[model samples]
Each structure stands twice: as C-alpha cells, then as structure tokens.
Target: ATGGYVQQATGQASFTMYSGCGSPACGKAASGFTAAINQLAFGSAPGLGAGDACGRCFALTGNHDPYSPNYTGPFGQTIVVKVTDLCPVQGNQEFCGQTTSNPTNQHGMPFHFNICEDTGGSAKFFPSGHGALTGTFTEVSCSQWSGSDGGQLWNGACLSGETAPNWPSTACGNKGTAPS
Candidate 1:
C-alpha cells in the first residue's frame, strides 16, 4: 500500500516538462503501462515516496514566470496530475537537485514536479508548450476522475517491494484520507 494522507494542505511548487520514459515508481512494475504520445507525467517530489506520495493525485495551476523572458504570459492552466515517478537528481542541473537534503529547486521551490509531457496530459496541461513554470497545488483523491492522465494514479504507483511488470493494485490514502 502507498501510505496514508500526507499532503493535506495546498502548496506552491515548480514544474519542468519532459519526455522521459523512466519513472522511478511506475517503471518496470507498471504492468504494460507503456508511454504513449501526449501522455503527461506528473513528477513526484524528491523523497515524497518515503511518505507515500506515490499514486497521489494533485490539481495544479501553472503560474506566469517573470524570468521567462519570451513567454511572459501566465498559462494559468488548471490540470490534474498524479505522482508516478521521482525526478532524477542530477549534478549539473540545479532544479533536479531538489532532494530530501535539498528541499528547493533552481526556481527556489521547496517542492518540484518534473512534469513529463509524455505521461498523458501534456497537451491539455500545457497546450502552449511553455515548459518551465511555477504552480500552486492541492492533493486530490485518486477517486475523483478517470479517463485522464490522472486516472492511472487511482491504481497507485509501484511500491518499493513491487518489482514485477504488473499494475499497482494496492490501495492507499484514497480511503483513509479523502480529498480536502
């Protein structure tokens, strides 16, 4: 099981889009949950999995970045996402440094999501293709909606002990903690 309610409060975080095929939590054990076109992946905050952040759903609304010289307009697009994988913490990248020891990213966000444009909702979440931005988010229940990128989250991400190429069936905070 993925753990109990963790992110009960609303918070701000950073998001960077990508098209990576590997998700720390969903890969290998995903039961044929292969990557598809336009499928967007919501990156899991570093170390959030220790607290059962995987399989958790979130509602995010992108904020306009003043630093983005060319794309100065606010996307303000409200989209739903699920915590499917942990963004890799690389040395050369500042944002990817957001680990348990390093709470913030290059954008100075304590929490960050390496949004995958290939998960299932990139086109809808970021239609303009404006990749980098900040956003405020609230943890939503996995039971809310289906048929979207977030729909897969209701099934939960692969647990640490789970290694087979099978879909995650174990339930978690979905019941113990309802969407606030």
Candidate 2:
C-alpha cells in the first residue's frame, strides 16, 4: 500500500487520493485537492495553463460516519462517482469528475461536496468509475476543502496570474466558468 493521505472527516473517497505528493489527486504541498488540480492546469506549468479541474465530479460515499447504523453505515450508503476519462492536452487528465449524489454545496460553497446515489461502490462508471482503490471512508466533512482559491473560479492564490491563490474559490462554476 502507498499509505497515501486519506481524507479526514471528509467522505470524499478519491479526495483522499493515495497517489504521489503533488500528484493529480493529491493537492500541492499543504494545499487542498482543488488547489492541486488548478496548479496542474493553470500554474506556470503548461498546456493552456488552467490546470486540471477534476474535482468537479469526484464524490465520497459510505456513511459520513464509517460506523453508522450499528457499527457503520450500511452498504446502501456507498457514494459512486463517474469520472470523466478525458485527458485534454493537459496532463493528469486520466480521472476527471462528472456526476455524483446529493450534489450541492454548503449554501453554495464550492468546497462543499454533494453526496450522490450509491452505485454499489464498484459501478463501471459511478462514485469511483472503477472502484480500483481499496480503503474505507472513515469520515467526511466540509471543512477539509480549504486553502488556495482556484485561479479560474476565485483569486484565492497568493498572486493573480502565476502563483496559486491562498484561498478557496468563492464560486462553483466550470473550471473557468464554462457553459452547462
């Protein structure tokens, strides 16, 4: 096992990506998931800049409380995510987000994860797209989505153009506010 960083109190299964540091899944050093994705596409890196906006479709399942019902939530409470496997010219585009359960924000807050229908956890294209990872969602909270405002959504980064803002995006639109 990679012993990757798991989401604490947050129900997002992939949010707690078990990949490399600064990896497409794992946010940048100390940064949250959103920030990391933004850096990958928008930062001074390359590929139209804009960074990877894969967080849009990612979702968490399995009881906000690992031990719900009797010990933990039942299997029906699983969260399935359908990732958009369309890697554009940018890199780390293998697993982009798409649809989920209870899709909504905390009063419209971007970090707020919207819980969706349970797809048996291993659906071919839902809640996980491929249920390839192994682990249990111990907790899921809204507070975890913080730090570095996405350059496209909001100017939360330290700077405006090059650096990653130091706050979360204030709006929850397309990566760069795209048309639905």
Candidate 3:
C-alpha cells in the first residue's frame, strides 16, 4: 500500500460526470478513477490551482437523500474518485461551488465532485443519467481507487496545463482544505 493517507471525515455532497483529458492532470499524467476539485475542497484558495486536488481519492456512496433516513439512489452504488481536474469556479457550473466560504452545489450540499469519463475511474453507476447525484464522500488513499502503488499522481512533477507551474504541485491532498 502506498501509505500517505490518513482517514478524513466524510460528508454529504453532489456528483456529476465529466469528459476528456480534464482541465490539467489526466492529459499530462496517468489516469484512474478520477474527479475534479470543488470549491469547498480547494477551489477558493487563491494560489492553490487545480493541482491541489490531484491524486486525492475519495470513496463515494450514493446517498441520494442524505436528509431522509434509510435512503439510497436506486441501487446504492459505491464508487471511487481521484481528483485530477477542476470544476471551474469561473464557469459557475450548476452543481459546483461558486464561493469558498459558503461553497455549495445545486442540492445545497457544502461540497461537490465531478467524475472524469475518459480515464480509469470514469463510470455511470446506478441511478445515473438523471443529472447530478447526491452522495457521501470519504477521503481515501489514492491507492484505494487505483492500485496498491496508485498512479504517478503522487509526485511534484506531474502537473496540469501546458505551461509549467500553472499548477504548482500535482502531489496529494488539497493542503488546508482536504481532510487529513
């Protein structure tokens, strides 16, 4: 096991599918069950950049109705996601956060995640095709999603964007934001 992870608190959030090489990481590095960063996780930090979320994997379970007791999204599918891109705050994506302090998705959840559809983690689980999904997320080790050794994302060299340092560190975690 590539042991750089310490379990973090889980939270209710929303999810949607994203396509392509993604904003920065996937096109430049090896891919896996990956996703994009949400404002609540790392988007609002002025100098962090999209790389802050890279390689951070989270285990997600369809909690379609977090407010309701004993609820699930149809079949209650569980999925894993690795952060490799950004759900651009500037674009104001419908299910993404627009602000940092109060970042929230369309469902009013404090966090959001977009699944990448081109690489290893791309998938549409149960109750998909119905738009953004409500779920619970736990920050797990990148190895949990990809493999025992994970991918090449756990290095300072892997980056997003054509220009160097556009994203400082393609390492792991979102610094002050992602749970430790």
Candidate 4:
C-alpha cells in the first residue's frame, strides 16, 4: 500500500447526468449494473491530473456524522465509482473554492470530486444533494465490469484533446453539463 499518502478532509462532491446510452470520453459502457452504479470524476487537482486519474475507480464513503440527520441508509455504503471524466477548475463553483497560492494549485484545484449519474433516490444518501466525503483514488480492478484493472497506480496526468485508452464503453446520451 502507498503508506505515504495523505488523507485530507478537503474533498467536495456533486452529481452528473449520465449520457443515457452512449460513450463519453472514458468509454465505460452505461448498461445494466454499470448503469445503475455510481460514477466519479477526479478533478485535475494539485497532486493529481486528469490524465492519470481518468479511467480509474475509487470507493468513496460518507463523511458526515453518522448521527447527523443528513445521514441516510447508504451513508455507510462504499460506492465504487469509476473516474470517467475530468473535473476542471472553476473559481465560482461550489467544489472549487478559490485558487490558493499553493504549488498544488499550480496545475489546478485539488480534492474536488464530482459524483456522476445519481438519480434523485441516490441523492437522499447525501447531504444537501452534495457534500464532503473521503476515499482512496487508485486503479483498482473491476470485478463486475470488463476491462478495468485497479492494480496499477495512475500517473495523474491528462493530455489535451486525447481520450484515455482504458476508459470503459458506455452508452452516450445527453451527459448533462461538462465537468466544472
């Protein structure tokens, strides 16, 4: 395990619309179990890059107080979401606060995560439709889905105008808004 990793309580989460029945850059197929499960977009933050984080999957657990009224049934559930897209920097966005002078901010905001494809029912599990959470981002293997190997460590680099080769195949519809 990467023991040197730091676990920061700085992550902000939100949901995105699935492309219904088509492929978005990451290539994950939006059918059956994949369609029903959660999807994620790791922001091109300071230490991480879209190139390295995209097409990866992470298991995110709820971060709110277990006893808080915002806690719901799936509060304790670990949602394994694949990084299907890139969350860009947004100065006025809920997740992206203000760009600090930190070197990590040299590339972009760090710890801004977007949870994609949540139906209204799934929103109930979260506080205020969006909130903070904690999780590990890695290239973990996918047992239920084909062509995902979670064993590799992502390089955290995303190139411009290029799609990740490892992205899963998903049906493309209106994916709603692009990652911000």
The best candidate in terms of lDDT: 3
Q: At residue 120, what lDDT does model 4 achieve?
A: 25
What TM-score does candidate 4 reach?
0.41
Position 47, candidate 1: lDDT: 31
Off by over 4 Å in 1: 1-9, 22-24, 27-51, 69-76, 127-129, 148-180
- Candidate 4 lDDT over 1-180, as tens digits, reads 011111232243333223332233333332221221121223233323233344444445455432344654344344555544544444424343323322122213344345544322224334554444433333234442233322222432222212323323211222322232
Candidate with the greatest TM-score versus the true structure? 3
Model 3, 1-180: lDDT tens digits are: 012212224777777777764445432343456677564454223244443445556788765643443554464357776565666555654666545344455577766777766774535443544445676887655545653213443234343222212223234434334322
lDDT: worst 10-residue window of model 2: 1-10
TM-score of each: 0.58, 0.24, 0.63, 0.41
Per-residue lDDT value at 151 in model 3: 40
lDDT of each structure?
0.45, 0.26, 0.52, 0.34
RMSD of 3: 8.1
Which 10-residue span in candidate 3 carries the lowest summed lDDT? 160-169
Q: Say which prediction, candidate 3 or candidate 4, comes out ahead on TM-score.
A: 3
Better of 1 and 4 by TM-score: 1
Ranking by lDDT: 3, 1, 4, 2
**Where's the lowest-lDDT run of ten residues in candidate 1?**
32-41
